[PDB]
């Protein structure tokens, strides 16, 4: 598994 | 075009100390040029940096489903990416090409800047020393400092102030992790 992993941003409140 | 602009940046920073022995994950939310809210793995939860980010901090912290993913990310994200990219990033070593030349072409016995050019190297950490007839000169050294070329290479110019007399031998010594023994280039007056 030589993939570069990433994170996703959470949705802001409202 | 004169219209107003509105910018949103999201940054995930993986900071590594002593290999991967210590890892600190930092998520940053930035509106225009102001960081509003952040997740610091050393803290374990979100914290508003400014008042604009307060409704996001208290909201995101309310969902332990979200906090658990981020807390675990120091392993599943940071340490994984370090592992995958280690060979071509962390361990990348490109040897510097070293050349020595006087800045001004002129007759001898006039003040001159002897430049030791060190280019095309990686990583950035390096030390350049000037020697005159086998003795190190520490004074009169002018450097451009570390210059990042943006193509995974650095360059630097380390200059020695001198009045070159005939018979003199000037030597530039470069130490860098890409070589086991110092690189030496000499210029004979």
């Amino acid at each position: 598994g030589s993939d570069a992993r990433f994170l996703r941003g959470y949705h802001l409140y409202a | 075009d004169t219209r107003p602009r509105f910018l949103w940046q999201l940054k995930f920073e993986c900071h590594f100390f002593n290999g991967t022995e210590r890892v600190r994950l930092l998520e940053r939310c930035i509106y225009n040029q102001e960081e509003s809210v952040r997740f610091d793995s050393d803290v374990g939860e979100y914290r508003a940096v400014t008042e604009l980010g307060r409704p996001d901090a208290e909201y995101w912290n309310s969902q332990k489903d979200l906090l658990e993913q981020r807390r675990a990310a120091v392993d599943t994200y940071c340490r994984h990416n370090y592992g995958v990219g280690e060979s071509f990033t962390v361990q990348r070593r490109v040897e510097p090409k070293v050349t020595v030349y006087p800045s001004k072409t002129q007759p001898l016995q006039h003040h001159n800047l002897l430049v030791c050019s060190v280019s095309g190297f990686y990583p950035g950490s390096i030390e350049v020393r000037w020697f005159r007839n086998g003795q190190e000169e520490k004074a009169g050294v002018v450097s451009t400092g570390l210059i990042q070329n943006g193509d995974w290479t650095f360059q630097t110019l380390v200059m020695l102030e001198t009045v070159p007399r005939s018979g003199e031998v000037y030597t530039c010594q470069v130490e860098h992790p890409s070589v086991t023994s110092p690189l030496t280039v000499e210029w004979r007056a």
């Binding site: 030589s2 993939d3 570069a4 990433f6 994170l7 996703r8 941003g9 959470y10 949705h11 802001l12 409140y13 | 075009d1 219209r3 107003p4 602009r5 509105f6 910018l7 949103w8 940046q9 999201l10 940054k11 995930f12 920073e13 993986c14 900071h15 590594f16 100390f17 002593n18 290999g19 939310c29 509106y31 225009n32 040029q33 102001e34 604009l52 409704p55 940071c78 990416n81 370090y82 995958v84 990219g85 060979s87 071509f88 990033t89 962390v90 090409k97 050349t99 030349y101 001004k104 072409t105 050019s117 280019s119 990583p123 950035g124 990042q148 070329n149 943006g150 193509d151 995974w152 360059q155």
Partner: protein, 180 residues
Amino acid sequence: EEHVIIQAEFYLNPDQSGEFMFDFDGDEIFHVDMAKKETVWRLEEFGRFASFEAQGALANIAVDKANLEIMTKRSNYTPITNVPPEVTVLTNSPVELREPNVLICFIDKFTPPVVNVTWLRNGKPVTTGVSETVFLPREDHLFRKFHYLPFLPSTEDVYDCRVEHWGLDEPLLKHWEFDA
């Protein structure tokens, strides 16, 4: 520390310009061509050891976009303050006449990430072989960018890197010519 890896994203209105990239100790590892949905490795050799699903970055941009709208409203539309770039022109290596080299135009400490760069050889626009990096992140949340022009050094030509940014009053010209 010893090292820092940064996943940096941005979305900008009303331009609708989005970016997704990874940074390592100040250097770009890769970014995603948004329009073509492909991973672009800064050094092509990188893609021989690692992979990234470019499609994943597009959802990130979609989230970034939505969040921007919300945040613009929250601040009741505080527009960004333009910061003009410091521009520097230098070369890849020491210049030797009639020996191939590269002009680097370094653009630094500016925001928003919109800039327009043109190379000028003796006052004429040059595009042959020119390349550029995407916008690179800074700790102060400003941006950097590099532009490149491969060229054959000669005593006969002068060069200008011309940069226009909303923070500047008039287009800036940084001059380069051989000197000796």
